[PDB]
Amino acid sequence: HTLVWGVWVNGVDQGDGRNIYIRSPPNNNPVKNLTSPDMTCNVDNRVVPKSVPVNAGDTLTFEWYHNTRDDDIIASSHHGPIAVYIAPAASNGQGNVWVKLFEDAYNVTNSTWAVDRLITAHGQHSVVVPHVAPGDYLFRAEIIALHEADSLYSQNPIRGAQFYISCAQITINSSDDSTPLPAGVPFPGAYTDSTPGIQFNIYTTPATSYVAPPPSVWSGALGGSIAQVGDASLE
Ligand SMILES: *[C@@H]1O[C@H](CO)[C@@H](O)[C@H](O)[C@H]1NC(C)=O
Ligand SMILES: [Cu+2]
C-alpha cells in the first residue's frame, strides 16, 4: 500500500502533485489483474490539469508514501522490484508506447530488494530525463510487491503479485533529441501469467534467482537511483 505524493526536479520539490500532475487513484490499494485497463495508470486514469516542466539531463525524483508524507512509505513485507517507464502523452498510455527507463530488483551486495531501499530513501527514487523530443510525456512508476506472488491472481484472486502504479504528467522543454523515443510495450499486455517475475516465491526461492519482468531498459536511458534527494521535513 503505497502512493506517489509528488516529484522533485534537480533536488527541488515541485509540491503536492496529487490530482494535480499525478493521475492519482482514490486510495493506495494494489492493482492485481494483469489484463485490466487499470494496469496503465491505475484506477482513475484521466488528464489532470498540470504538467511538471523538465529539461533533458535533469534528475526527476518520485516520492512515495503510505498514509501521510514521509511515513513508513510501504510495508516491509512488500519486497519487490521498481521500474519506471515513459510514453508520449498523446497516446494516453494506449498502444505499444511504454519504454523502460529504469529497473532495480535485488541488489546482491547489500542483500536488499528495491522496495527495502525505497523505504530507507524516504520514498524517493529518480531517473535522469532522456534526450527525447520536447513535448508532453507520461512517466509511469511501478512497484511490484511479491509477498503473495506464489499464486497467480487469475487462478486465485485473493493472492497474486501486487502492482502500485503511478503516472505523472511531465513536459520536456529543452532537449537536443539525440535519442528519439522508440516504440515500446503496452500496459495492459506486457505482463502475462507466464512472464518471468510475475509468479515467484520469495520465501523459499533465493532472491538471486529473481528475474524482473521484461522489457529490458532502453539503451537511451541515462540512469537513476533509489536514494533520498531532499528532506520533506524542510521543503
Ligand atoms: C480482469 O480484467 C478484465 C478486463 O477488464 C476482465 O475481463 C476480467 O474479468 C478480470 N479478471 C478477474 C479475475 O476479475
Ligand atoms: Cu500493501
Which one, of 32, 2, 11, lies nearest residue 141 by Cα? 2
Report how far apart the first and last C-alpha atoms of the chain are (Å, whole number). Answer: 24
Q: Per the annotation, does 9 bind a ligand?
A: yes
Phi/psi of residue 176, nearest 5 degrees? -80, 0
Instruction: For 164, list phi and psi in degrees, rounded to 5.
Output: -110, 110
Mutate to test the pocket of ligand 1, among 31, 35, 39, 159 (most ligand atoms within 8 A of CB): 35
How does DSSP classify residue 98? B
Residues constituting the chain: 235
Where does the chain have alpha helices with state H? 38-41, 114-120
**Domain residues of the chain, as ranges?**
2-235
How buried is 129 (Cβ within 10 angstroms: 0-12 exposed, 13-18 middle, 19+ buried)? buried
CA distances from 128 to 16, 101, 139, 229, 230 (A): 21, 9, 12, 13, 16
Give the Cα separation of 124 and 47 in Å (integer): 24
3-state SS, residue 120 = helix
79, 116 in Cβ contact below 8 A? yes
Please report the resolution in angstroms: 2.1
User: Minimum-distance ligand to the CA of 67?
Assistant: 2
Residue with cell 526527476: 60
Q: What are phi and psi of 170, to 5 degrees?
A: -125, 135
d(CA 206, CA 192): 22
| Mode of pairing for the β-strands spanning 162-172 and 52-54 | parallel
Q: From the CA of 34, give the closest atom in ligand 1.
A: 1
Indicate the DSSP class of residue 208: G
Instruction: Find out whether 115 is annotated in a ligand binding site.
Output: no
> What does 23-64 look like in DSSP terms, one character per residue?
---SS-PPB--TTSTHHHH-S-----S--EEE-TT-EEEEEE
Minimal-distance CA residue to ligand 1 atom 11: 33
Q: Report the alpha-carbon distance of residue 186 to residue 196 in Å, rounded.
A: 16
Please state, in angstroms and rounded to a whole number, the distance separating the CA atoms of residues 111 and 81. Answer: 13
Residues 6+ apart with CB under 8 A from 199: 149, 150, 151, 152, 161, 193
Asked if the 2-235 domain carries CATH number 3.30.1360.170, the reply is no
Beta pairing, strands 3-9 & 12-13 = antiparallel
Residue showing cell 525524483: 61
C-alpha cell at 103: 529497473
Residues 6+ away with beta carbon under 8 Å from 217: 100, 101, 102, 103
Alpha-carbon distances of 83 from 48, 55, 178, rounded to whole Å: 23, 21, 23
